[PDB]
Short mmCIF file of C-alpha atoms in Angstrom, two decimals:
data_model
loop_
_atom_site.label_atom_id
_atom_site.label_comp_id
_atom_site.label_asym_id
_atom_site.label_seq_id
_atom_site.Cartn_x
_atom_site.Cartn_y
_atom_site.Cartn_z
CA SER A 1 -117.20 187.88 1.55
CA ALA A 2 -117.62 184.10 1.88
CA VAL A 3 -120.68 182.41 0.36
CA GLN A 4 -121.73 178.79 0.70
CA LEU A 5 -123.60 178.86 -2.61
CA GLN A 6 -126.13 176.04 -2.27
CA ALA A 7 -127.03 173.91 -5.29
CA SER A 8 -129.50 171.05 -5.62
CA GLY A 9 -131.35 168.91 -8.14
CA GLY A 10 -130.26 166.86 -11.10
CA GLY A 11 -131.05 163.51 -12.65
CA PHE A 12 -130.76 161.65 -15.95
CA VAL A 13 -132.37 162.99 -19.14
CA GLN A 14 -132.31 162.10 -22.83
CA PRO A 15 -130.26 163.77 -25.59
CA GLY A 16 -131.78 166.53 -27.67
CA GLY A 17 -134.10 167.69 -24.88
CA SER A 18 -133.81 170.50 -22.36
CA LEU A 19 -133.16 171.12 -18.67
CA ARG A 20 -132.13 173.81 -16.19
CA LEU A 21 -129.14 174.61 -13.99
CA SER A 22 -129.43 175.63 -10.33
CA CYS A 23 -127.26 178.10 -8.40
CA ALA A 24 -128.45 179.74 -5.17
CA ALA A 25 -126.44 181.79 -2.67
CA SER A 26 -126.79 180.89 1.02
CA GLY A 27 -123.89 182.95 2.36
CA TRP A 28 -122.63 186.52 2.70
CA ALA A 29 -121.03 187.84 -0.52
CA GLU A 30 -118.96 190.92 -1.29
CA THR A 31 -121.51 192.76 -3.48
CA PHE A 32 -124.40 192.44 -5.96
CA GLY A 33 -122.42 190.95 -8.84
CA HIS A 34 -122.83 188.75 -11.89
CA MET A 35 -123.87 185.09 -12.02
CA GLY A 36 -122.99 182.34 -14.52
CA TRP A 37 -121.79 178.79 -14.97
CA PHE A 38 -118.60 176.87 -15.76
CA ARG A 39 -118.35 173.36 -17.22
CA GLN A 40 -115.58 170.76 -17.48
CA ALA A 41 -115.65 167.90 -19.96
CA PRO A 42 -114.03 164.59 -18.91
CA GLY A 43 -110.37 164.86 -19.81
CA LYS A 44 -110.74 168.53 -20.77
CA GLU A 45 -110.14 171.76 -18.87
CA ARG A 46 -112.89 173.87 -17.33
CA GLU A 47 -114.83 175.94 -19.86
CA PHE A 48 -116.83 179.12 -19.31
CA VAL A 49 -120.53 178.70 -20.12
CA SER A 50 -122.70 181.78 -19.62
CA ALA A 51 -122.68 185.21 -17.98
CA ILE A 52 -125.62 187.37 -16.78
CA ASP A 53 -126.05 190.26 -14.26
CA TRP A 54 -128.28 190.70 -11.16
CA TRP A 55 -131.01 192.28 -13.36
CA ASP A 56 -130.87 190.23 -16.61
CA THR A 57 -129.96 193.38 -18.58
CA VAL A 58 -126.87 191.96 -20.32
CA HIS A 59 -127.10 188.50 -21.87
CA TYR A 60 -123.75 186.87 -22.69
CA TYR A 61 -124.37 183.42 -24.17
CA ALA A 62 -121.79 180.97 -25.44
CA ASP A 63 -121.95 180.20 -29.14
CA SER A 64 -122.39 176.50 -28.36
CA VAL A 65 -125.50 177.46 -26.34
CA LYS A 66 -126.77 180.46 -28.33
CA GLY A 67 -130.31 180.28 -29.69
CA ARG A 68 -130.90 177.21 -27.52
CA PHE A 69 -129.83 178.01 -23.95
CA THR A 70 -131.66 181.11 -22.72
CA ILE A 71 -130.36 182.41 -19.39
CA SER A 72 -132.65 184.78 -17.42
CA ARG A 73 -132.78 186.00 -13.75
CA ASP A 74 -136.08 186.20 -11.77
CA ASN A 75 -138.60 189.06 -11.24
CA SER A 76 -138.40 188.46 -7.51
CA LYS A 77 -136.87 185.04 -6.71
CA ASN A 78 -133.29 186.29 -7.22
CA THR A 79 -132.23 183.29 -9.40
CA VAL A 80 -130.84 183.36 -12.99
CA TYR A 81 -132.22 180.52 -15.19
CA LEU A 82 -130.28 178.92 -18.06
CA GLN A 83 -133.11 177.17 -19.92
CA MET A 84 -131.71 174.78 -22.52
CA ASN A 85 -132.91 173.57 -25.92
CA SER A 86 -131.70 170.96 -28.44
CA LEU A 87 -128.86 169.72 -26.27
CA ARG A 88 -125.50 169.06 -27.92
CA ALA A 89 -122.50 167.08 -26.70
CA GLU A 90 -120.39 169.95 -25.32
CA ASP A 91 -123.13 171.06 -22.90
CA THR A 92 -123.11 167.75 -20.97
CA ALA A 93 -120.49 168.07 -18.22
CA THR A 94 -119.96 168.79 -14.52
CA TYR A 95 -121.19 172.35 -14.08
CA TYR A 96 -120.07 174.92 -11.51
CA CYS A 97 -122.03 178.12 -10.96
CA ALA A 98 -119.95 181.22 -11.71
CA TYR A 99 -120.18 184.60 -9.98
CA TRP A 100 -118.47 187.81 -11.07
CA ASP A 101 -118.55 191.28 -9.50
CA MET A 102 -118.99 194.25 -11.85
CA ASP A 103 -121.63 196.58 -13.27
CA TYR A 104 -120.05 198.06 -16.41
CA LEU A 105 -118.27 195.23 -18.24
CA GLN A 106 -114.94 196.49 -19.53
CA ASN A 107 -113.92 192.84 -19.89
CA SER A 108 -115.50 189.58 -18.72
CA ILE A 109 -112.17 188.51 -17.17
CA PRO A 110 -112.35 189.06 -13.36
CA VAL A 111 -114.01 186.27 -11.36
CA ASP A 112 -114.82 186.61 -7.67
CA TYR A 113 -116.86 183.64 -6.43
CA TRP A 114 -117.73 179.98 -6.93
CA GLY A 115 -120.34 177.56 -5.64
CA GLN A 116 -121.61 174.00 -5.70
CA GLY A 117 -123.28 172.50 -8.75
CA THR A 118 -126.09 170.27 -10.01
CA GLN A 119 -125.60 166.72 -11.31
CA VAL A 120 -127.24 166.86 -14.76
CA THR A 121 -126.70 163.86 -17.06
CA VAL A 122 -127.94 163.74 -20.66
CA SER A 123 -128.10 160.24 -22.15
CA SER A 124 -130.64 157.86 -23.67
CA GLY B 1 -107.55 181.19 -18.95
CA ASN B 2 -104.64 179.45 -17.23
CA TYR B 3 -106.60 177.52 -14.62
CA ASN B 4 -103.67 175.14 -14.08
CA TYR B 5 -102.33 177.44 -11.36
CA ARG B 6 -104.45 177.15 -8.22
CA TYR B 7 -104.51 178.66 -4.74
CA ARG B 8 -106.02 177.79 -1.37
CA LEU B 9 -108.35 180.03 0.61
CA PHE B 10 -110.59 177.87 2.83
CA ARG B 11 -107.85 176.37 4.98
CA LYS B 12 -108.56 175.90 8.68
CA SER B 13 -105.02 175.83 10.06
CA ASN B 14 -102.07 178.16 9.65
CA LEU B 15 -98.72 176.93 8.35
CA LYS B 16 -95.33 177.05 10.02
CA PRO B 17 -92.39 178.78 8.31
CA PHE B 18 -91.46 176.78 5.20
CA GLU B 19 -94.25 174.26 5.79
CA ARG B 20 -95.86 172.54 2.80
CA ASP B 21 -99.50 171.48 2.56
CA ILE B 22 -100.73 169.35 -0.34
CA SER B 23 -103.87 167.80 1.15
CA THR B 24 -106.92 168.51 -1.03
CA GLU B 25 -109.64 167.14 1.26
CA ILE B 26 -112.97 168.96 1.33
CA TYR B 27 -112.73 171.57 4.08
CA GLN B 28 -115.44 171.22 6.73
CA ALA B 29 -116.39 174.83 7.40
CA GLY B 30 -118.99 174.71 10.16
CA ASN B 31 -121.59 173.07 12.35
CA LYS B 32 -123.51 170.76 10.02
CA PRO B 33 -121.53 167.54 9.42
CA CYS B 34 -120.64 166.77 5.83
CA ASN B 35 -119.11 163.27 6.16
CA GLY B 36 -116.64 164.21 3.43
CA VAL B 37 -119.30 165.50 1.01
CA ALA B 38 -119.26 169.17 0.03
CA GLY B 39 -122.36 171.17 0.88
CA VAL B 40 -123.65 173.06 3.91
CA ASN B 41 -120.83 174.31 6.16
CA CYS B 42 -118.25 172.87 3.75
CA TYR B 43 -115.99 174.32 1.07
CA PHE B 44 -113.22 173.09 -1.18
CA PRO B 45 -109.96 174.65 0.10
CA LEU B 46 -108.42 174.59 -3.39
CA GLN B 47 -109.45 177.27 -5.89
CA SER B 48 -108.19 177.56 -9.44
CA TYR B 49 -106.52 180.82 -10.44
CA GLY B 50 -108.22 182.87 -13.11
CA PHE B 51 -105.12 183.76 -15.10
CA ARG B 52 -105.38 185.52 -18.47
CA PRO B 53 -103.11 188.18 -20.00
CA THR B 54 -106.22 190.34 -20.03
CA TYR B 55 -106.36 190.94 -16.27
CA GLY B 56 -105.49 193.51 -13.63
CA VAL B 57 -101.85 193.67 -12.57
CA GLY B 58 -102.86 192.84 -9.01
CA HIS B 59 -104.88 189.93 -10.37
CA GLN B 60 -102.10 189.15 -12.86
CA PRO B 61 -99.94 186.10 -12.05
CA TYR B 62 -96.56 186.68 -10.43
CA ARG B 63 -93.75 184.12 -10.28
CA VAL B 64 -92.23 184.23 -6.79
CA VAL B 65 -89.01 182.48 -5.77
CA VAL B 66 -87.93 182.41 -2.11
CA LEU B 67 -84.37 181.54 -1.07
CA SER B 68 -83.47 180.86 2.57
CA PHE B 69 -79.72 180.97 3.16
CA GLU B 70 -77.95 179.88 6.33
CA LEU B 71 -74.99 182.20 6.92
CA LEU B 72 -73.23 179.95 9.42
CA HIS B 73 -70.38 177.47 9.47
CA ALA B 74 -70.07 174.06 7.72
CA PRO B 75 -69.26 173.94 3.98
CA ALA B 76 -71.56 176.10 1.92
CA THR B 77 -72.42 175.54 -1.74
CA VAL B 78 -72.05 178.98 -3.36
CA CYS B 79 -68.98 181.23 -3.06
CA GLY B 80 -68.11 183.04 -6.38
CA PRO B 81 -64.25 182.72 -6.59
CA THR B 82 -55.75 181.20 -2.58
CA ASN B 83 -52.69 179.06 -1.58
CA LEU B 84 -52.25 178.69 2.20
CA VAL B 85 -49.35 180.35 4.07
CA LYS B 86 -48.30 178.50 7.19
CA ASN B 87 -46.41 180.68 9.68
CA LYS B 88 -47.26 184.36 9.13
CA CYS B 89 -49.97 186.68 10.40
CA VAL B 90 -52.23 186.66 7.34
CA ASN B 91 -55.93 187.25 6.81
CA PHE B 92 -57.82 184.02 6.08
CA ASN B 93 -61.28 183.52 4.48
CA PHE B 94 -61.50 179.71 4.79
CA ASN B 95 -64.93 178.67 3.33
CA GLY B 96 -66.61 181.84 4.72
CA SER C 1 -81.76 199.03 -5.17
CA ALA C 2 -80.88 199.58 -8.87
CA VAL C 3 -84.00 200.49 -10.92
CA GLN C 4 -84.01 201.86 -14.46
CA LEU C 5 -86.98 203.95 -15.59
CA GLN C 6 -88.23 204.39 -19.17
CA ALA C 7 -90.34 207.55 -19.51
CA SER C 8 -91.45 209.00 -22.84
CA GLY C 9 -94.11 211.23 -24.35
CA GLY C 10 -95.02 214.90 -24.11
CA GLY C 11 -95.32 217.35 -27.01
CA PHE C 12 -96.78 220.87 -27.17
CA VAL C 13 -100.10 221.03 -25.31
CA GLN C 14 -102.57 223.93 -25.37
CA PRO C 15 -104.72 225.74 -22.78
CA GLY C 16 -107.32 223.10 -22.00
CA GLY C 17 -105.28 220.36 -23.65
CA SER C 18 -104.21 217.03 -22.22
CA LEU C 19 -101.30 214.61 -22.06
CA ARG C 20 -101.00 210.82 -22.25
CA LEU C 21 -97.54 209.94 -20.95
CA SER C 22 -95.79 206.62 -20.30
CA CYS C 23 -93.18 205.38 -17.83
CA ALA C 24 -91.84 201.85 -18.15
CA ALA C 25 -89.87 200.19 -15.35
CA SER C 26 -86.98 197.73 -15.52
CA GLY C 27 -84.49 196.58 -12.91
CA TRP C 28 -84.21 194.75 -9.61
CA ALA C 29 -85.60 196.62 -6.62
CA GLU C 30 -85.55 196.04 -2.88
CA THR C 31 -89.36 196.24 -2.85
CA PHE C 32 -92.19 196.90 -5.29
CA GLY C 33 -92.38 200.65 -4.86
CA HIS C 34 -94.79 203.09 -6.45
CA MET C 35 -94.19 204.75 -9.79
CA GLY C 36 -95.36 208.28 -10.49
CA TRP C 37 -94.24 211.80 -11.34
CA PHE C 38 -92.46 214.43 -9.27
CA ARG C 39 -92.96 217.56 -11.34
CA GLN C 40 -91.35 220.78 -10.20
CA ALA C 41 -93.19 223.80 -11.51
CA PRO C 42 -90.76 225.79 -13.69
CA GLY C 43 -88.23 227.15 -11.22
CA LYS C 44 -90.02 225.57 -8.23
CA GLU C 45 -89.48 222.58 -5.95
CA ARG C 46 -90.21 219.03 -7.08
CA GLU C 47 -93.86 218.30 -6.31
CA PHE C 48 -95.79 215.04 -6.26
CA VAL C 49 -98.28 214.82 -9.15
CA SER C 50 -100.23 211.54 -9.07
CA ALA C 51 -99.09 208.16 -7.75
CA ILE C 52 -100.48 204.73 -8.60
CA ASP C 53 -99.96 201.65 -6.46
CA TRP C 54 -97.90 198.90 -8.06
CA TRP C 55 -100.78 196.51 -7.39
CA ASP C 56 -103.18 199.14 -8.82
CA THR C 57 -105.06 199.44 -5.54
CA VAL C 58 -104.28 203.04 -4.50
CA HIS C 59 -104.71 206.20 -6.58
CA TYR C 60 -103.52 209.68 -5.64
CA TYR C 61 -104.35 213.18 -6.84
CA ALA C 62 -103.43 216.73 -5.87
CA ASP C 63 -105.29 220.04 -5.97
CA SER C 64 -102.93 221.53 -8.55
CA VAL C 65 -103.70 218.46 -10.70
CA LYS C 66 -107.21 217.46 -9.58
CA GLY C 67 -109.79 217.22 -12.34
CA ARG C 68 -107.03 217.49 -14.95
CA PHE C 69 -104.64 214.64 -14.10
CA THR C 70 -104.76 210.86 -13.73
CA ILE C 71 -102.14 208.10 -13.57
CA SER C 72 -102.68 204.57 -14.89
CA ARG C 73 -100.34 201.65 -15.53
CA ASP C 74 -100.36 199.67 -18.76
CA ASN C 75 -101.29 196.05 -18.12
CA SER C 76 -99.45 194.82 -21.25
CA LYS C 77 -96.09 196.61 -21.48
CA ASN C 78 -95.99 197.76 -17.82
CA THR C 79 -95.60 201.41 -18.85
CA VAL C 80 -97.49 203.62 -16.41
CA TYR C 81 -99.24 206.44 -18.25
CA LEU C 82 -100.06 210.01 -17.25
CA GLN C 83 -103.37 210.58 -19.04
CA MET C 84 -105.43 213.64 -18.16
CA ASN C 85 -108.47 215.69 -19.18
CA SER C 86 -108.27 219.44 -19.88
CA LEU C 87 -104.87 220.29 -18.46
CA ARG C 88 -104.57 224.02 -17.83
CA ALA C 89 -102.28 226.57 -19.46
CA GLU C 90 -99.85 227.01 -16.53
CA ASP C 91 -98.23 223.55 -16.63
CA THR C 92 -95.14 224.69 -18.57
CA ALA C 93 -92.86 222.54 -16.43
CA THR C 94 -90.38 219.68 -16.71
CA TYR C 95 -91.91 216.47 -15.34
CA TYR C 96 -89.63 213.94 -13.64
CA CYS C 97 -91.06 210.41 -13.44
CA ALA C 98 -89.82 209.74 -9.88
CA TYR C 99 -89.90 206.33 -8.08
CA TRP C 100 -90.76 205.83 -4.41
CA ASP C 101 -89.20 202.37 -3.77
CA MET C 102 -91.61 201.73 -0.87
CA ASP C 103 -94.86 199.79 -0.72
CA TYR C 104 -96.68 202.62 1.08
CA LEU C 105 -96.22 206.40 0.93
CA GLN C 106 -96.22 207.79 4.46
CA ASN C 107 -94.63 210.97 3.11
CA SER C 108 -93.63 211.77 -0.46
CA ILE C 109 -90.43 213.70 0.36
CA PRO C 110 -88.01 210.69 0.48
CA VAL C 111 -87.98 209.57 -3.18
CA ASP C 112 -85.58 206.59 -3.40
CA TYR C 113 -85.49 206.50 -7.21
CA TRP C 114 -86.28 209.14 -9.83
CA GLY C 115 -86.84 209.64 -13.53
CA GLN C 116 -86.20 211.88 -16.50
CA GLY C 117 -87.69 215.34 -16.84
CA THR C 118 -90.46 215.81 -19.41
CA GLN C 119 -90.43 219.40 -20.68
CA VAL C 120 -93.81 220.33 -22.19
CA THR C 121 -94.86 223.93 -22.82
CA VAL C 122 -98.53 224.91 -22.87
CA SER C 123 -99.34 227.41 -25.63
CA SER C 124 -100.98 227.36 -29.05
#
């Protein structure tokens, strides 16, 4: 029930473009649960970003990322993919991959796991 | 989400009775050296608490206060509520 | 320990009906014991019904109540319910909301604290 979720990649990109977030599990979990991301603006508290299951059936997007950020898992690669569009200010922060554990979502409240993140910077 | 409250899970060493630990260094979890950089075989011992009123009671936050008395001699500090006699067989309760 | 219990609910159920009770707790206790109901069948001995763990990790059921009883604690007002599905016509008893003041129930006979009797008849 301890995962060393491995994350890699990053770089510097320009505003108004698009990118992707990386979150891969390299440890032994507690079950086949949900995957997501959390962000923290400088001087602000950590903010929930997106939620998606192991089979991309349910698609919970944040309103700040709706219509632009399209999360989706993989046919076989076992990796959800938050593909961005038309980047705004709130989406540029230090991201941490989220991981919940549930099938039928009574509430999106219980978290179970955390992992490393990817250094994505969006500036001219 | 009250993430201000945090707990520790990936701590290598146990703590003695009434021993405080405040170090937040990245915990080196295994074989591959990290040189103080989180990654393979390395975790952050501190984890924020997911605390919302919408939660399970077991997952719900609980405020715990622990008091450790010393029922022994020397002056105490707390004793709810006299006049000393000086030659007669009388029960005494001098500071405890 | 000195624990006060706040049980309420009941009514006039029918053959195949159901109940949705409540039992709030208030008062200092030696330990966080389990709430629940000790119902004696009318004129019978007090019998365990269904016990929930205070941490909501252990659930209990009995043959006389299986399939038609369930206990659940309110997460908001801390009033543990007794909500069931298709309770039979024989449960014309008075239900005491008893209180085992122990963290684990080795045996149900020693019931440190107790509750008030809920008298519900079952007829249309």
